[PDB]
Amino acid sequence: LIPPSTFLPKRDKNVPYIAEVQSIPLSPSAYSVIIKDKSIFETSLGSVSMSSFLTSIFDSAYIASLKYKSDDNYKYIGIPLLNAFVEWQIEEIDDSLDDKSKEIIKSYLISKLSAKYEKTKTENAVRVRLSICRDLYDTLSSDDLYYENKVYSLTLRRFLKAVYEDYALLSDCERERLIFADNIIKINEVIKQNGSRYYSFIYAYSNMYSREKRRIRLIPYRIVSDEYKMYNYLVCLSDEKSAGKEFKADSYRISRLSGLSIAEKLSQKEYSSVTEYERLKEGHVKSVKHLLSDPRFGSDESDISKVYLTEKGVEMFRKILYQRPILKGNEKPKPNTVNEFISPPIQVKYYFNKFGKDGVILSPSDSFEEMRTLYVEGADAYNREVE
Amino acid sequence: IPPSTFLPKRDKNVPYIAEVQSIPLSPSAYSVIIKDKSIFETSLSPNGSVSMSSFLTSIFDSAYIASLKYKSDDNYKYIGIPLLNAFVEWQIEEIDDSLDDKSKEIIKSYLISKLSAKYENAVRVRLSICRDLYDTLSSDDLYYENKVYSLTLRRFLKAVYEDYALLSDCERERLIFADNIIKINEVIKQNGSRYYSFIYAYSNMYSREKRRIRLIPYRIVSDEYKMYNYLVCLSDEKSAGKEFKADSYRISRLSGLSIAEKLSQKEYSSVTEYERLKEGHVKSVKHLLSDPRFGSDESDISKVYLTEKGVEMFRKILYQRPILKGNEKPKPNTVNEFISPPIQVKYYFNKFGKDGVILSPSDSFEEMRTLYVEGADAYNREVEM
């Protein structure tokens, strides 16, 4: 006769909280994506419990939805907006519409999201046991999930299944931004404070260029994905490469930063190394621009690699775009000749390692010697299976 | 007046010349489409090819007809064909028919305006427009697409192929094999609950050469990996023509699908009692609906020997990394079974050398052996004075 409003009832805060367990039935495919992401995250950061990992995903996705039209939504730039969260999808409705039109659109959205996450699937579901911590309990019992309560008809099981099934469908780089949301939020705060003036740096811990964590100074510029949606990078100025002495453009995997500090202002000597007339110097701008377009390999150095391409090699070069290196002045490669690549030698090697005789890396000597070893030992392995 | 359609109506009295449209695709979309094309081609006769234009045209034709026919009398034909966000007609027709006209017009305007805003270092893909695609792109049957993409063909086609590339493997496979799916759906509708009729089909499923079998379709389902779609059916293959038994066929390994013929009364009485599927067939079919692949699909497993170093490289190199059997962790210094397409295993382990040796299938082994043996000879030759 009178329905509850929230997924879970408000708890007596006077009584100690005891964590209740919710069983979430996940598709084998969603479970296996979450297992993979969890053991990859752990290598950053041991062990994290499945509950903690599922809670991080929920917390990140939720705060981006809740704060979508917030005054401080600059904090959540790049945090994915999951289809399972509904607040953002209501707030996205054209603000210029009359109230009656918005109510009709709101009902159209609630009904279509209900139908989508209410479709019974034929599957062998994996029972995933989420322990609900006090902070998650208070979120799931709050009034701040109004539209989710309506879409999922007050059924926590349905809501959480939808969150984790949607998580599992995101690209690698999207899933990574949910997992490392806390790094992204602190970076977004500093980018806003700094604008174009780059008054301030943050301290951060990096194992990007070291086995042990180094405390370095970063001047953030922009977070980007590679073009294949694999990894997120902070393009920035860093003092790592000169070991504290001066700031140079670089690109850090967001997964290899931790323990980010509040922004502190640079000293006038240091501010004058970075900026002139309160703008990033031409040299920093140029280097940053190179890293925005290639945030994996832009960070390495422009040395010559000599590669002999056959006719077949040029045809393979034309068809295989993944991490494909460039010639001088972005020329087309020439068949049956030595071609000069100016991309970092490591990227040339990662491209032509699958070409064998159709893409023979002649130099530098390093690349020649690694390819010769890979191929001679590989050949011996394949021949061993025949004889 | 001013243009109404993506392309103007052509004078049909003039011989047709295919004009080429340059479509700027994200590197990620292009890489998904060239992989799909290579994998589709492995369904054809040994050395067989499709042009990029033909492959992109098939994707467009499948996605389009599912959108156009979403509410039609014969929409039974398109059950399971993905409805791309790039196509708009279905999204207008999906509006709850029970709403008053004013509410529907408000939702229609909300959808047109929001889809306009959403689809407003590319790989330039040169799509040759065949006569039938030209006549579609110049028809009035893209009313809402013309509004959403402001009459700009480049924008519409980019949206189609970017959305294609975002689908799961099994969704993309259902657009590519739509013609098989449509013929299967026709027979599912005709049969309903009575299963009166079978179709003949050719299977690459359980033979090296195409085998002519009889199928009673039940339902198309995806495996637990969202990799391949299976027709769950009854089939006469296992008893070699003698009787119908529950089975599962990759829709990618069915071809030459015939008209439905009615079963003979001896055969109909093996399959049904009182015009309903016998409990035994129901029970076997139910196991295959929840897992259509496990312990029926043995066909194109890749055997790869990984060293300790191989396992470390497997852990670190995620790009197009193939799926193990049951999604197990790979094991060092032993043969590992990969259930990803043989092409994807080969594109992953071609850079592993002795740390990732593809032992089977025979084709993969012989290509890798040739790549490595001829590669070694090329690198060794450069050390000779």
Numbering used by the authors:
A (entry chain B): 2 to 46, 50 to 391
B (entry chain A): 3 to 122, 128 to 392
Text of the article:
The Type VI-D CRISPR-Cas system employs an RNA-guided RNase Cas13d with minimal targeting constraints to combat viral infections. Specifically, the N-terminus of RspWYL1 harbors a ribbon-helix-helix motif reminiscent of transcriptional regulators; the central WYL domain of RspWYL1 displays a Sm-like β-barrel fold; and the C-terminal domain of RspWYL1 primarily contributes to the dimerization of RspWYL1 and may regulate the RspWYL1 function via a large conformational change.
To gain mechanistic insights into the modulatory role of WYL1 in the newly discovered Type VI-D CRISPR-Cas system, we determined the crystal structure of the full-length WYL1 protein from Ruminococcus sp. (RspWYL1) by the single-wavelength anomalous dispersion (SAD) method. Each asymmetric unit in the crystal structure contains two RspWYL1 molecules, forming a diamond-shaped, ∼95 × 85 × 80 Å homodimer. On the other hand, the CTD−CTD interactions involve 16 residues to generate an interface area of ∼1300 Å2, accounting for the majority of intermolecular interactions of the RspWYL1 homodimer (∼60%). The NTD of RspWYL1 harbors two RHH motifs, denoted RHH1 and RHH2.
